[PDB]
Amino acid sequence: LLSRGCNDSDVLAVAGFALRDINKDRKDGYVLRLNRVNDAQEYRRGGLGSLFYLTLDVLETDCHVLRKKAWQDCGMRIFFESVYGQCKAIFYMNNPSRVLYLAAYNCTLRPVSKKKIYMTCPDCPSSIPTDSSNHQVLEAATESLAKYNNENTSKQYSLFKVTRASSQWVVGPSYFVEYLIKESSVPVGLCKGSLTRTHWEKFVSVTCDFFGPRGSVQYLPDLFPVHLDLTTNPQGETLDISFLFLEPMEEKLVVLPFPKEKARTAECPGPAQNASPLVLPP
Amino acid sequence: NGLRDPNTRWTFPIPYILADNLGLNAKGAILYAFEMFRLKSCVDFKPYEGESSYIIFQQFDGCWSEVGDQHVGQNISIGQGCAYKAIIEHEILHALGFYHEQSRTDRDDYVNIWWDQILSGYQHNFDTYDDSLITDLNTPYDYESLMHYQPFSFNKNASVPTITAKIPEFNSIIGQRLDFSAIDLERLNRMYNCTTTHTLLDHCTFEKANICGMIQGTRDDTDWAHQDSAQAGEVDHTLLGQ
Amino acid sequence: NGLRDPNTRWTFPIPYILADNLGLNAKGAILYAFEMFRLKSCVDFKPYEGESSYIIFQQFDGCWSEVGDQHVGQNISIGQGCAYKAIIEHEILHALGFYHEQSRTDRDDYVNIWWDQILSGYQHNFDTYDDSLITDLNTPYDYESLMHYQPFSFNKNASVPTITAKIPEFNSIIGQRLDFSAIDLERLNRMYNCTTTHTLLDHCTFEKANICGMIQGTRDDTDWAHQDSAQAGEVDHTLLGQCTGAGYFMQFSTSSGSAEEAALLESRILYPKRKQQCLQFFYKMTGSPSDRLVVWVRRDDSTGNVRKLVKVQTFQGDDDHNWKIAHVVLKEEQKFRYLFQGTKGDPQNSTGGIYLDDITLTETPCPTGVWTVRNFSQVLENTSKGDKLQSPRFYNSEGYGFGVTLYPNSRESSGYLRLAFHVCSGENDAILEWPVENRQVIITILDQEPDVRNRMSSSMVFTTSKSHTSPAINDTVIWDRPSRVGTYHTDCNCFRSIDLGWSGFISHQMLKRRSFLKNDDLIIFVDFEDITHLS
Amino acid sequence: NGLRDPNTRWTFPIPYILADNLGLNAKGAILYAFEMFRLKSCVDFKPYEGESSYIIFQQFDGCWSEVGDQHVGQNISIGQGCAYKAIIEHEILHALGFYHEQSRTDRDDYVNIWWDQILSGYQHNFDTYDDSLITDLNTPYDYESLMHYQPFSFNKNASVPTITAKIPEFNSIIGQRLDFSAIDLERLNRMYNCTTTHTLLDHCTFEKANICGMIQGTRDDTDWAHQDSAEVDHTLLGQCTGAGYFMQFSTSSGSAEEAALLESRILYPKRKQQCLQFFYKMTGSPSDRLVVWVRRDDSTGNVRKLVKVQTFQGDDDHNWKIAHVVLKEEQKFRYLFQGTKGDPQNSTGGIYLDDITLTETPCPTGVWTVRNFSQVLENTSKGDKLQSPRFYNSEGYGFGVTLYPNSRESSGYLRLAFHVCSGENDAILEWPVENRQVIITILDQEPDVRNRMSSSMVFTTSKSHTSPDTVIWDRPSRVGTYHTDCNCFRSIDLGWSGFISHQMLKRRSFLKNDDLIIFVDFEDITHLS
Ligand SMILES: *[C@@H]1O[C@H](CO[C@@H]2O[C@@H](C)[C@@H](O)[C@@H](O)[C@@H]2O)[C@@H](O[C@@H]2O[C@H](CO)[C@@H](O[C@@H]3O[C@H](CO)[C@@H](O)[C@H](O)[C@@H]3O)[C@H](O)[C@H]2NC(C)=O)[C@H](O)[C@H]1NC(C)=O
Ligand SMILES: *[C@@H]1O[C@H](CO[C@@H]2O[C@@H](C)[C@@H](O)[C@@H](O)[C@@H]2O)[C@@H](O[C@@H]2O[C@H](CO)[C@@H](O[C@@H]3O[C@H](CO)[C@@H](O)[C@H](O)[C@@H]3O)[C@H](O)[C@H]2NC(C)=O)[C@H](O)[C@H]1NC(C)=O
Ligand SMILES: *[C@@H]1O[C@H](CO)[C@@H](O[C@@H]2O[C@H](CO)[C@@H](O[C@@H]3O[C@H](CO)[C@@H](O)[C@H](O)[C@H]3NC(C)=O)[C@H](O)[C@H]2NC(C)=O)[C@H](O)[C@H]1NC(C)=O
Ligand SMILES: *[C@@H]1O[C@H](CO)[C@@H](O[C@@H]2O[C@H](CO)[C@@H](O[C@@H]3O[C@H](CO)[C@@H](O)[C@H](O)[C@H]3NC(C)=O)[C@H](O)[C@H]2NC(C)=O)[C@H](O)[C@H]1NC(C)=O
Ligand SMILES: *[C@@H]1O[C@H](CO)[C@@H](O[C@@H]2O[C@H](CO)[C@@H](O)[C@H](O)[C@H]2NC(C)=O)[C@H](O)[C@H]1NC(C)=O
Ligand SMILES: *[C@@H]1O[C@H](CO)[C@@H](O[C@@H]2O[C@H](CO)[C@@H](O)[C@H](O)[C@H]2NC(C)=O)[C@H](O)[C@H]1NC(C)=O
Ligand SMILES: *[C@@H]1O[C@H](CO)[C@@H](O[C@@H]2O[C@H](CO)[C@@H](O)[C@H](O)[C@H]2NC(C)=O)[C@H](O)[C@H]1NC(C)=O
Ligand SMILES: *[C@@H]1O[C@H](CO)[C@@H](O[C@@H]2O[C@H](CO)[C@@H](O)[C@H](O)[C@H]2NC(C)=O)[C@H](O)[C@H]1NC(C)=O
Ligand SMILES: *[C@@H]1O[C@H](CO)[C@@H](O[C@@H]2O[C@H](CO)[C@@H](O)[C@H](O)[C@H]2NC(C)=O)[C@H](O)[C@H]1NC(C)=O
Ligand SMILES: *[C@@H]1O[C@H](CO)[C@@H](O)[C@H](O)[C@H]1NC(C)=O
Ligand SMILES: *[C@@H]1O[C@H](CO)[C@@H](O)[C@H](O)[C@H]1NC(C)=O
Ligand SMILES: [Ca+2]
Ligand SMILES: [Ca+2]
Ligand SMILES: [Ca+2]
Ligand SMILES: [Ca+2]
Ligand SMILES: [Ca+2]
Ligand SMILES: [Zn+2]
Ligand SMILES: [Zn+2]
């Protein structure tokens, strides 16, 4: 096994492509930007390419995966609601055959540390779990949806799911949300909106945009372990890859166990797109 | 409650951008808050001209500021209803390196936090900073402070206060949204070495026998009495015979 | 009256030299004047250490300064007789870029100059300056200014003033030399961007329901009331019933409950800048004689936790029920809070309580001795010319016993108060050096205002010296062992030296003005300390 | 018993880490042990700051240390009950490079080991090392050594001693836990080229005719005599003919208010605080005054600024009395004694001064002298008791000690037990009082601290100290027993059955003038948490 640098020109492109494949594979949540390659290691096989094992540092972008954008098509999210963390991925490459493939992955993500946000900006809307225990977040998304249905006479829409949420209390209870919808289907667009009550005046706002491999993502509580192996075998696993080829010739790949981070080079981790200690992973 | 590190201090005038996503009501409320700063302190504002740090005010989600001068220049948000002058003033005090008053190191001497009554996921908004991070500016904890949170902030139940003053009178006072408090100005002035307000040109109440350095003419026939408020109905306006 | 050009400003601390041509008294007085700057402003001073601009203080002809920072460094003269703090403060205000008040551009609106009464060739000392040379710092003309000339300045005839106020009442007030005026501090602060001051660490008058960020303990038994002065005969010390609905004091009742119940009034955390402080406050103990007001210090244990307790002083109920002044020497070099334990002794024998108001904490020495005369206005009327009052004996850091003689009506001039220091015999005399050779005597009539910046106290200074002698003691030094030289007083069972100090320390009209008699009483501080180490 | 290899010698200060697995009591007791090193030797200790070798003190199983400087740094264990001054001094002496005294090469000349009585699997704990591994530092074998094993060490049958001195009298003396012995300090001095201590600033018994370099005032009326014990001194009590010396100022003659200054040498304080201990008598008038002064530097390098620090008056007791004055000098100074005559017509006597000792340490917070203590032991039934006057700590907690002069728990032992007294401050103090380390010390009464081997027991007031079932250290007014004896609500008493044995109290000058001096400190150690 050859440990590789995180600033290497092949490793950088492979990580971007692998992350784009993960975003395309994902059925829910948001397109992830590659903050940097975090570790990289390679198994070499002569003329028929190599197998790469990558660890990444990553950030959540402004686009839901149902929009099907690449992460270069998407902006940096605001600091007070950034989701950040790390991915492990296994990826075959053979440029002479023009064959590139995400074999498997797992990712651990978190909302940005609530203490470190408070310290940076005390009034910033602190991010929260989107599950149905938060009645008032559901009230926020349904109020913004009701406002959108009252504004848009051509069609009417129903709440599918709430995808992101936060709140602030300065002028009063002030909730900010992103959520998915369908007409009255696969969810047809991503809504963004808010609900605020003062003791006297009340406000609602809304804007909305209309639009296998083994692996996983988890969203954990805030302060990055990642479980991943296609095999336990020290010999590695002769996994079929014949179906990758333009004529599906009989081809099988020896997947070794995931190369451990104790084999990191001094060229890892790489240079970050966003080095801020709030959202740069450990 | 001021950020100790002197690098975090602005150098006046703070250059500002108003983003065009701001309503007119929010742009005008910002410029009205600036007039209050200029009127009550040496804090000053100027339009942007390419400076290294500046505030951009925004109609983003919520109403919030990074604390102190970020030397790259920084967002402030003013969401709906934060058009109120005092909420702009509060966010600009965050921009001027000030944390919430209940986030003072000594805050537990002055306010109860009812952690059990805070919404789950929001207890950290009642964190308190150590004295290496923040100065007291040799000032007392101020319940009248604009930087203080009201009793019903981040609460589970609308009837139940998250935060209460240990002197119980001040429950009716904490988190006022009138203006800067006198101690918020005293702090702001200690933070920026302000001795003279930009717009208070003069004031006078005649309490002193030099009559605020007024003079009486001689071209006129006669003089105004400097009158002692002592006669039966004839009280001053400053003290009303109190 | 400030020199406009911002190049003429100092950068604090002002580096300084005391030349050896200054008498010890003058060196000591200059340091005392710096302590007033450090106490009332952000102005500070450091000994010289090779800076490009600095002040050197010297005993040249007369008492004078260049104006503003001369960037090569500059002389202040303090000639013989200019040792009093207000003259030093006036000269240091010249070095700090101030002109005289009657030289303001607008001065003709506020003062008459009787040009024909000025001595010939002295008309220029009354030259005004234009607004290009000088700022008003957006402040009115201040008759009470220290910079303002006295009515009799450069005058031909000793009966006739050179300069008089157009508001005729201020004829009596122009050229006060008590202290900085309130507006002189305002102008100095507007000039040098000051807001804090180096040596006022806290003060409290309780006028605000916030109680100055004081807190009440909960490991104590009860609480001090934040008592409103509205109740009959039960006023605060800040206002003494002058304002309705608005005088406040803390009161710990001792009239009911068990003995040894207590309440710990606790101040906000303080961060001292020096190794020593003086907590001054005003209090009453109208309750039981077994009631204790105890002052406590809660201090940092070096873990950032202000939990350590240190008892510093105790006070008890004499038959005097009126507002007493207290001073407590604190020695805090780490963050600390000053505390007042009120304690009930025998509530069955208390008809009252313990009271606090007018708290002031300065990072200074305390007044070494403190003397209060009750009902002074009534004393001053009742007393004949040349009659005396004598202060109780006090002991200095070195243990020299001393006191002040107050002659309320000066026989030497009508309408003046004469106030004179003497060494008392005391328990230590048999081991002290004699004659007293270099002990500076500072006497101050406290202006009873809690905020030190508001205060404009009167103070006179001398150093006990070999030159001080009288034929009444066969031409020997006055400061020799009082048993050998002084005169006996069964009034305290002491000898007391011949008394030195000023006929007309202060005038009766000046004492009445500025509310020096805040409670109609008079509080005199004395210090008496060795300045030999300045030689 | 010193490790010969010079590479094993620490270079001072020894950097230390107090690991948080130590109880507060152990942390405080280790800082107290460091003070004894700095007071009796040139050894010094500092908080750790990244140094290559260092001592980390930890609560592991029992008491142990690697011997000498291990150049990578090393553990010292201080387990349960291990947190006593002499036990900590024993383990620090191991780290400084000393083996146990019975492991000397020549030990056989001085002790018997009864091998048959050693527990099986402990034989090597009585090994002796050759003169290649060790060094006698050219000192005799010391039975009194702190590094010596107690006779019943590692025995099978608890009745039977493992180790005995060949000179049989020393068997009681061996394995003392009072503190370092003179020889141990002497061996430590030779090993670390120590010449003086860090916090013994001065001492004076006047035995030398130069009166320890003290000088008499001329800006006073009279002089102290350097009096010859022809009425005796405190250093010798007249044991030696012609050598008893003490300063005496007679007050039976002359006017009143007549005085004499005696002034020390000029002294250069290494710390902010010192304790001036001395012994004195005031057999003269009640109005005579013994005033301690400081002539400190006036900040121009001239020692002339007087500061009055304490006054002592005369009680009916005219026996030698122990004084302490806290000095707070940070610049060079003389301590001074003003003796003053009050009412000579009503003095038959004077003021006296012997055995002065100045240390750069806190003064004992409370100090109790029990007079004619041999007579007390002869008079007093088992389980009868004596109780100190009510001291107050720096925080204002009222406290005292209970002495049971004949222990009920065993023959020939004292019990000393601390208790918290009600006092004038209690209503404002926290309760229970805990994290306050009690140190009770029986003073050894040598005027030279290096000679002294004071016996000292330490504990920390704690929540775990609850008597069936509220904390003993909760507020005395409501968990203490009332005493008409001082109008005090003294609390339940905690301490040591067998603080010291009578047969040890007979020796070492613990009862130097046939009287027993107990020091107490009761100081908050919460800041060590
Ligand atoms: C009860 O307390 C009073 C004084 O306290 C006052 O009266 C109580 C009834 C309550 O109303 C308290 O709130 C109030 O403050 C004690 O009276 C004082 O006793 C002392 C000692 O005997 C007297 O001092 C002496 O005074 C003479 C001169 O008159 C001097 O020569 C002495 O040196 C000494 O100072 C004091 O005069 C006296 N004052 C009055 C007004 O009587 C009272 O003794 C006490 N009673 C009990 C039983 O505790
Ligand atoms: C003269 O001085 C004695 C004490 O001094 C001793 O006697 C002198 C004659 C000289 O020989 C000195 O060198 C010698 O030290 C005074 O006597 C003492 O007075 C006090 C105060 O009254 C007594 O204290 C009280 O005693 C009772 C018990 O008797 C206690 O209950 C009290 O609490 C309190 O302690 C003390 O006992 C007494 N001592 C003796 C031995 O008589 C004497 O008063 C003094 N006389 C004059 C006129 O100055
Ligand atoms: C408000 O007034 C304050 C004084 O009351 C100013 O505080 C001074 O600012 C100086 C920098 O402008 C500091 O100088 C630095 O001092 C440190 C040591 O403390 C040195 O390491 C630095 O090298 C030195 N910097 C330079 C350029 O020499 C002063 O120490 C500091 N004094 C105090 C008492 O804090 C504030 O700057 C001023 N603030 C504003 C916004 O006006
Ligand atoms: C009290 O506070 C004042 C602000 O309220 C300070 O005044 C500012 O000082 C700046 C220098 O520290 C001045 O900048 C310089 O201005 C001149 C023209 O006046 C230019 O030629 C210089 O290029 C420029 N300096 C640089 C480095 O470019 C400010 O003009 C000045 N502002 C005002 C409104 O006066 C005072 O300095 C301060 N004084 C004291 C004693 O603390
Ligand atoms: C204010 O916050 C916004 C985010 O809401 C920042 O704008 C982002 O900036 C990055 C870098 O140019 C882009 O990738 C994003 O697409 C931007 N997002 C949006 C919505 O504009 C902005 O830079 C911040 N400005 C300041 C002065 O702090
Ligand atoms: C909000 O808090 C109030 C006060 O704690 C709760 O009101 C009480 O509710 C009970 C039933 O649970 C009634 O029997 C009492 O009479 C109510 N008291 C008052 C003052 O009205 C209230 O239930 C809480 N609501 C929520 C949603 O938490
Ligand atoms: C100094 O001023 C006084 C007061 O104006 C002068 O006093 C006058 O003197 C004459 C006699 O020389 C008297 O007739 C007047 O009655 C005095 N006036 C007052 C008001 O008392 C004095 O003469 C002046 N002297 C000089 C040398 O100028
Ligand atoms: C102090 O003693 C402890 C053992 O009680 C040492 O800790 C062990 O160190 C080794 C080597 O690094 C580890 O393999 C063990 O797992 C550690 N055990 C425990 C219980 O922590 C410690 O290293 C010693 N320190 C020094 C400076 O001597
Ligand atoms: C411990 O040693 C003692 C003293 O040598 C032993 O005591 C003797 O025990 C026998 C019975 O075994 C008695 O007959 C003797 O009278 C005892 N002698 C004395 C002096 O008391 C004891 O047996 C030993 N115990 C153990 C456990 O070894
Ligand atoms: C002060 O004057 C009042 C009368 O107004 C009198 O009752 C009081 O006793 C006087 N106090 C003193 C100490 O003279
Ligand atoms: C101590 O013993 C002596 C006899 O040597 C006796 O006179 C004296 O009264 C005793 N004193 C005390 C305090 O027991
Ligand atoms: Ca007019
Ligand atoms: Ca209380
Ligand atoms: Ca008041
Ligand atoms: Ca002796
Ligand atoms: Ca002498
Ligand atoms: Zn805020
Ligand atoms: Zn050992």
Q: Is residue B71 annotated as involved in ligand binding? A: no
- At B79, list the tokens: 């969401």
C55-58 and C14-18: which strand pairing?
parallel
For residue D436, what is the enclosing H or E element? strand D436-442
**Cis, peptide link before residue D364, omega less than 30° from 0:** no
Question: Which residues in chain D precede a discontinuity of more than 2.5 Å between C and N?
Answer: 230, 468
**Cis, peptide link before residue C13, omega less than 30° from 0:** yes
User: Cα(C307) to centroid of ligand 11, in Å?
Assistant: 46
Is the minimum distance from the CB of C65 to ligand 1 under 6 angstroms?
no
Q: Where a domain ends, among D198, D231, D252?
A: D198
Q: Is residue D198 annotated as involved in ligand binding? A: no
Please judge whether B140 and C269 are an interchain contact, meaning their C-beta atoms are less than 8 angstroms apart: no
Residues C158 and C13 in one domain: yes
Residue of B144, B193, B210 with shortest CB distance to C140: B210
Atom number, ligand 9, closest to the C-alpha of residue D160? 2
Do B and A make contact via 3 or more CB pairs under 8 A? The reply is: yes
Question: Rounded to an integer, what distance in angstroms lies between the CA atom of residue D158 and that of residue C213?
Answer: 65
**In sequence order, which residues have a C-beta less than 8 Å from that of residue D123 and are 6 or more positions away?**
D115
User: Cα(C7) to centroid of ligand 4, in Å?
Assistant: 9
CB neighbours (10 Å) of residue D382? 12
Q: Is residue B203 annotated as involved in ligand binding? A: no
Query: From chain A, which residues contact B within 8 Å (Cβ)?
Result: 78, 80, 114-115, 118-126, 128-129, 166-172, 174, 176, 194, 196, 198, 201, 203, 205
Q: Which residue has the tokens 């530097």?
A: D297
CA atoms within 13 A on the CB side of B112: 15
Q: Where a domain ends, among D165, D183, D198?
A: D198
**Comparing C-alpha atoms, which of D516, D524, D483, D496 is closest to residue D417?**
D496
CB neighbours (10 Å) of residue D215? 14
Do D and A make contact via 3 or more CB pairs under 8 A? The reply is: no
User: Cα(C135) to centroid of ligand 4, in Å?
Assistant: 16
**Cis, peptide link before residue C151, omega less than 30° from 0:** no
Q: What is the DSSP letter of C307?
A: E
Q: Annotate B111-148 with b (16+ C-beta within 10 A) or e (fewer).
A: bebbeeebbebbebbbbbbeeeebbbbbbbbbbbbbbb
Ligand nearest to the CA of C206: 14
C196 touches chain B (CB under 8 A): yes
> What is the Cα A152 distance to its own chain's centre?
31
Residues C264 and C392 in one domain: no
Please check whether residue A110 is in contact with residue A219, taking contact to mean a CB–CB distance below 8 angstroms.
yes
E-state strands within C137-224: 163-165, 200-204, 215-216
Domain count, chain D: 3
Is the minimum distance from the CB of C161 to ligand 1 under 6 angstroms?
no
Across the beta sheet with D215-216, the strand order is D215-216, D259-263, D333-340, D289-297, D303-312
D466-467 and D470-471: which strand pairing?
antiparallel
User: Cα(D158) to centroid of ligand 18, in Å?
Assistant: 20
Q: What is the DSSP letter of C152?
A: S
Helix/strand/coil (H, E, C) string of C419-453? EEEEEECCCCHHHCCCCCCCEEEEEEECCCCCCCC
Residues D214 and D194 in one domain: no
Please check whether residue D281 is in contact with residue D370, taking contact to mean a CB–CB distance below 8 angstroms.
no
Phi, psi of D7 (to 5 degrees): -65, -20
Question: For residue C9, which amino acid is it?
Answer: R
Residues C274 and C423 in one domain: no
- At D242, list the tokens: 């012609």
Question: Rounded to an integer, what distance in angstroms lies between the CA atom of residue C254 and that of residue C258?
Answer: 9
CB neighbours (10 Å) of residue D444? 20
Phi, psi of C19 (to 5 degrees): -70, 150
- At C433, list the tokens: 């050096």
Domain that holds residue C241: 199-368
Residues C152 and C179 in one domain: yes
**Comparing C-alpha atoms, which of D491, D472, D486, D468 is closest to residue D432?**
D472
Question: Rounded to an integer, what distance in angstroms lies between the CA atom of residue B147 and that of residue B102?
Answer: 8
**Comparing C-alpha atoms, which of C245, B106, B155 is closest to residue A172?**
B155
Question: For residue D382, which amino acid is it?
Answer: K
Q: How many residues does chain A have?
A: 282
D289 touches chain C (CB under 8 A): yes
Question: To 10 degrees, the CA torsion angle through C67, C71, C77, C83?
Answer: 80
Cα–Cα–Cα angle for D289, D290, D296, rounded to 5 degrees: 125
C273 touches chain B (CB under 8 A): no
**In sequence order, which residues have a C-beta less than 8 Å from that of residue C491 and are 6 or more positions away?**
C390
Phi, psi of A242 (to 5 degrees): -55, -40
Question: Which residues in chain B precede a discontinuity of more than 2.5 Å between C and N?
Answer: none
Interface A–B counts its CB contacts (< 8 A) at 89
Question: For residue C120, which amino acid is it?
Answer: S
Cα–Cα–Cα angle for D478, D480, D481, rounded to 5 degrees: 120
Please check whether residue D496 is in contact with residue D457, taking contact to mean a CB–CB distance below 8 angstroms.
yes
Atom 5 of ligand 8, residue of closest alpha carbon? D60
- At B203, list the tokens: 């004031």
Phi, psi of C274 (to 5 degrees): -125, 170
**In sequence order, which residues have a C-beta less than 8 Å from that of residue A134 and are 6 or more positions away?**
A128, A165
Residues D378 and D426 in one domain: yes
* 3-state class (DSSP) for residue D474: coil
Is the minimum distance from the CB of A75 to ligand 5 under 6 angstroms?
yes
Q: Annotate B52-87 with b (16+ C-beta within 10 A) or e (fewer).
A: eebbbbbbbbbbbbbbbbbeebbbbbbbbbbbbbbb
- Calculate helix-pair angle for D182-191, D85-96, nearest 10 degrees: 30
Cβ < 6 Å from ligand 11: which residues?
A: D 371-372, 375
Residue of A114, A123, A201 with shortest CB distance to B81: A201
Residues D130 and D189 in one domain: yes
Question: Rounded to an integer, what distance in angstroms lies between the CA atom of residue D430 and that of residue C307?
Answer: 10
Mutate to test the interface with C, among D223, D428, D487, D523 (most CBs of C within 10 A): D428
Residues D375 and D493 in one domain: yes
- At C33, list the tokens: 């004047």
**Comparing C-alpha atoms, which of B58, B48, B63 is closest to residue B17?**
B48
Task: Write out chain A residues lying below 8 Å of B65, CB-based.
Answer: 121, 123
What resolution in angstroms does the PDB record give?
A: 2.8
Task: Write out chain C residues lying below 8 Å of B212, CB-based.
Answer: 140
Task: Write out chain B residues lying below 8 Å of A174, CB-based.
Answer: 62-63, 79
Is the minimum distance from the CB of C6 to ligand 4 under 6 angstroms?
yes
Question: To 10 degrees, the CA torsion angle through A44, A46, A49, A54?
Answer: 10
Residues C220 and C343 in one domain: yes
**Comparing C-alpha atoms, which of C121, C68, C111 is closest to residue C91?**
C68
Atom number, ligand 1, closest to the C-alpha of residue C286? 15
C258 touches chain D (CB under 8 A): no
Q: Which residue has the tokens 């090193």?
A: D37
Mutation test residue for ligand 1: of C255, C315, C349, the one with most atoms within 8 Å of CB: C349
Which technique was the structure solved with, according to the deposited record? cryo-EM
- At C516, list the tokens: 């020096």
Mutation test residue for ligand 8: of D58, D75, D78, the one with most atoms within 8 Å of CB: D75
Q: Which residue has the tokens 């101690």?
A: B183
Task: Write out chain B residues lying below 8 Å of A196, CB-based.
Answer: 79-81
Please check whether residue B79 is in contact with residue B58, taking contact to mean a CB–CB distance below 8 angstroms.
no
D299 touches chain C (CB under 8 A): yes
Q: DSSP labels for C183-199?
A: HHHHHHHHHHT--S-TT
B55-58 and B14-18: which strand pairing?
parallel
The neighbours of chain D, by the rule of 3 or more Cβ pairs under 8 Å, are C
- At A253, list the tokens: 């790949």
**Comparing C-alpha atoms, which of C78, C54, C68, C64 is closest to residue C125?**
C64
- At D133, list the tokens: 């591994």
B107 vs chain A: nearest CA distance in angstroms? Answer: 16
B137: phi > 0 → left, psi -120 to 50 → alpha, else beta; which?
left
Question: Rounded to an integer, what distance in angstroms lies between the CA atom of residue C452 and that of residue B189?
Answer: 19
**Comparing C-alpha atoms, which of B74, B91, B71, B73 is closest to residue B29?**
B91
* 3-state class (DSSP) for residue C236: coil
Mutation test residue for ligand 3: of B3, B4, B7, B9, the one with most atoms within 8 Å of CB: B9
Sign of CA pseudo-dihedral D183, D184, D186, D187: positive
C248 touches chain B (CB under 8 A): no
Mutate to test the interface with C, among B4, B190, B200, B215 (most CBs of C within 10 A): B215
User: Cα(B151) to centroid of ligand 6, in Å?
Assistant: 18
Please judge whether B122 and A126 are an interchain contact, meaning their C-beta atoms are less than 8 angstroms apart: yes
Q: How many residues does chain B have?
A: 242
Q: Which residue has the tokens 């002034």?
A: D263
- At C432, list the tokens: 């002290």
CB neighbours (10 Å) of residue C232? 6
**Comparing C-alpha atoms, which of B4, B52, B105, B94 is closest to residue A120?**
B94
Question: Rounded to an integer, what distance in angstroms lies between the CA atom of residue C408 and that of residue C384?
Answer: 8
Active-site residue, selected from the candidate residues B49, B89, B91, B169: B91
E-state strands within D118-250: 134-135, 163-165, 200-204, 215-216, 225-227, 246-250
Question: For residue A186, which amino acid is it?
Answer: V
C530 touches chain D (CB under 8 A): yes
**Comparing C-alpha atoms, which of D59, D75, D73 is closest to residue D23?**
D59
- Calculate helix-pair angle for C85-95, C24-40, nearest 10 degrees: 70
Sign of CA pseudo-dihedral D184, D188, D190, D196: negative
- Please name every residue paired with D289 in a beta bridge, in sequence order, or none if there are none: D340
User: Cα(C43) to centroid of ligand 3, in Å?
Assistant: 14
Do D and C make contact via 3 or more CB pairs under 8 A? The reply is: yes
Which ranges in chain A belong to alpha helices (H)?
9-25, 114-120, 135-151
Query: How big is chain C by its Cα radius of gyration, in Å?
Result: 25
Question: Rounded to an integer, what distance in angstroms lies between the CA atom of residue A105 and that of residue A55?
Answer: 10
Q: Annotate D108-132 with b (16+ C-beta within 10 A) or e (fewer).
A: eebbebeeebbeeeeeeebebbeee
Please check whether residue D394 is in contact with residue D491, taking contact to mean a CB–CB distance below 8 angstroms.
no
Q: Annotate C452-465 with b (16+ C-beta within 10 A) or e (fewer).
A: bbebbbbbbbbbbb
Residues C377 and C505 in one domain: yes
E-state strands within D12-118: 14-18, 45-47, 55-58, 63-65, 74-78, 111-113
